[PDB]
Amino acid sequence: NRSLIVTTILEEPYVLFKKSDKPLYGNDRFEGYCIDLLRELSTILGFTYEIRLVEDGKYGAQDDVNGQWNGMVRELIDHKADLAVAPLAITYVREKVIDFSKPFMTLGISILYRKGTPIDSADDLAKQTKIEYGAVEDGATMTFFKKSKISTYDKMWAFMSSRRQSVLVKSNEEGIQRVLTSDYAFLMESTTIEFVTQRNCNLTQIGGLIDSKGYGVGTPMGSPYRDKITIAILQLQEEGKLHMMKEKWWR
Amino acid sequence: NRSLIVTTILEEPYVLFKKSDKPLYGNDRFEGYCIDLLRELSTILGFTYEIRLVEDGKYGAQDDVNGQWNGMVRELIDHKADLAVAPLAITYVREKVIDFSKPFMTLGISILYRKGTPIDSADDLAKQTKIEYGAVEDGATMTFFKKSKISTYDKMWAFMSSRRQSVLVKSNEEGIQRVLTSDYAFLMESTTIEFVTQRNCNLTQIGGLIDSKGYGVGTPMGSPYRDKITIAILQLQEEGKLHMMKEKWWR
Ligand SMILES: C=C(C)[C@H]1CN[C@H](C(=O)O)[C@H]1CC(=O)O
Numbered sequence: 001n002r003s004l005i006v007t008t009i010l011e012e013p014y015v016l017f018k019k020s021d022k023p024l025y026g027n028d029r030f031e032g033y034c035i036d037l038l039r040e041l042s043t044i045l046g047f048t049y050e051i052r053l054v055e056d057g058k059y060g061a062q063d064d065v066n067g068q069w070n071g072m073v074r075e076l077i078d079h080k081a082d083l084a085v086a087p088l089a090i091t092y093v094r095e096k097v098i099d100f101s102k103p104f105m106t107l108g109i110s111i112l113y114r115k116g117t118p119i120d121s122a123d124d125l126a127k128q129t130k131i132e133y134g135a136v137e138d139g140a141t142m143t144f145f146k147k148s149k150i151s152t153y154d155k156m157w158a159f160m161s162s163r164r165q166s167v168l169v170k171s172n173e174e175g176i177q178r179v180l181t182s183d184y185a186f187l188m189e190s191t192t193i194e195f196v197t198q199r200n201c202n203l204t205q206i207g208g209l210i211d212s213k214g215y216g217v218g219t220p221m222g223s224p225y226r227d228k229i230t231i232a233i234l235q236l237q238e239e240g241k242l243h244m245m246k247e248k249w250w251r
Numbered sequence: 252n253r254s255l256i257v258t259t260i261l262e263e264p265y266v267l268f269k270k271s272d273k274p275l276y277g278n279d280r281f282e283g284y285c286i287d288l289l290r291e292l293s294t295i296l297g298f299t300y301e302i303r304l305v306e307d308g309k310y311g312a313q314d315d316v317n318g319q320w321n322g323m324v325r326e327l328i329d330h331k332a333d334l335a336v337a338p339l340a341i342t343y344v345r346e347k348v349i350d351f352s353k354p355f356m357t358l359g360i361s362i363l364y365r366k367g368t369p370i371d372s373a374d375d376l377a378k379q380t381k382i383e384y385g386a387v388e389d390g391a392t393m394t395f396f397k398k399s400k401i402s403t404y405d406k407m408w409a410f411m412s413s414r415r416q417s418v419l420v421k422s423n424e425e426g427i428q429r430v431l432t433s434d435y436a437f438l439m440e441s442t443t444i445e446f447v448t449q450r451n452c453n454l455t456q457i458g459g460l461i462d463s464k465g466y467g468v469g470t471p472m473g474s475p476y477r478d479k480i481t482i483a484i485l486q487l488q489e490e491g492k493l494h495m496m497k498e499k500w501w502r
């Protein structure tokens with residue numbers, strides 16, 4: 001049985017380079033929530049695999065003009081990878097081109113901002129133009145605002161869109177630093193906000209969840225592995241493994 | 252200036268009877284998140300008040316048959332109280348008969364269940380009948396399902412409605428005990444689930460948040476105190492006090 005090619009991307013605490021003095025080889029060079037998840041999926045389902053980092057460094061978005069997909073989503077579409085195991089959001093637009101297992105983690109979009117201000121919700125940001133705000137460019141969060149029919153979010157999209165190169169960033173880290181060094185609020189996924197605020201007492205989540213979504217394993221559309229991965233994830237859930245992995249990497 | 256009559260209700264860790272070795276009088280007989288909140292509200296705004304427990308022990312729902320409102324919402328409507336300070340959900344139906352300050356806490360509906368099973372979402376419950384499920388009768392959670400146009404939730408409402416006396420309960424504690432002793436899942440507010448699961452390792456939240464809402468201070472509609480309470484809440488927010496109050500009472 002040839003080994004599966006599993007595409008992923010660096011993102012703390014899901015995927016990180018394992019540190020050591022002694023040389024690390026193959027899949028052992030990686031660690032994190034998604035790495036532990038993947039290992040369990042392989043032993044539960046009985047497959048071997050090789051971890052690779054998505055070449056273009058993206059999750060998956062469709063080009064507005066040429067309509068082509070990029071990121072891990074595109075690698076799956078083109079059968080360049082068998083599975084994608086990362087904090088990949090399960091979204092309607094993505095489900096149209098690839099398949100997803102049931103979620104291994106639930107979350108929602110929220111706001112990351114500095115403490116000490118009266119800003120208390122998305123509405124507060126939307127009704128003003130002084131404090132700038134944004135999201136990772138073309139990520140699931142930004143796309144949510146772009147496709148939203150809700151006036152408040154539509155207004156926010158118009159804002160970010162008009163100042164695209166100034167307010168949209170390339171990573172969660174860039175967004176975090178931007179919040180820390182300027183009057184800026186960052187729209188990001190709650191599970192990452194959770195990790196960040198526990199490590200920086202100057203940061204806080206603002207308001208509650210803007211939506212409800214989850215992360216799932218991606219497979220090429222029609223892959224016989226999608227349903228099998230779901231079975232493995234459900235077993236991990238009932239065995240309390242998913243909860244243990246969350247506590248392990250978030251602590 | 253006459254003292255304001257503040258209505259509230261017993262609910263850990265928001266409102267509890269303070270335990271003492273010496274007799275306690277007036278407002279000193281109560282403690283909890285909402286009691287600390289109310290105290291800060293009074294000093295920021297300069298009013299005196301008397302805490303009272305809602306006479307009928309209800310939060311506020313409208314009777315399906317005769318259309319009469321009950322609970323704290325009704326006491327405000329009839330001007331029997333000036334303010335309602337409790338874990339009272341800000342909802343569309345309630346906003347029609349009373350006014351709410353901006354929320355002092357955000358949360359969402361979710362599922363409380365025992366650990367060790369493959370049950371992973373509302374859909375899992377909705378598509379079966381073996382495992383019974385419900386919520387506090389006529390509370391904000393039950394009303395959400397009753398008014399929902401989402402197929403999944405509408406199906407769940409049909410279930411609860413048809414087994415009303417068997418699956419709907421009178422309190423959170425009742426739903427909790429029910430989850431611990433029988434094959435039952437309880438739909439409850441996330442902030443309470445958080446308190447409960449931290450104190451009972453046998454319990455766990457299932458899935459993500461089903462909706463997004465918040466708790467707010469209630470006032471008779473048109474009351475001049477509503478905007479003043481909001482000013483106080485936003486101040487507590489920016490000063491980090493709402494966060495400390497949450498930490499204090501949730502541990
Ligand atoms: C880290 C990044 C750029 C990812 C992770 N989940 C989202 C995705 O699956 O696109 C992105 C974050 C976001 O959009 O807030």
Ligand SMILES: C=C(C)[C@H]1CN[C@H](C(=O)O)[C@H]1CC(=O)O
Pocket residue numbers: 262310311338339340386387389390391392393422423438439440
């Ligand atoms: C404790 C109770 C019955 C309250 C608290 N918030 C909700 C309300 O404001 O109705 C209810 C819980 C729920 O409906 O799940």
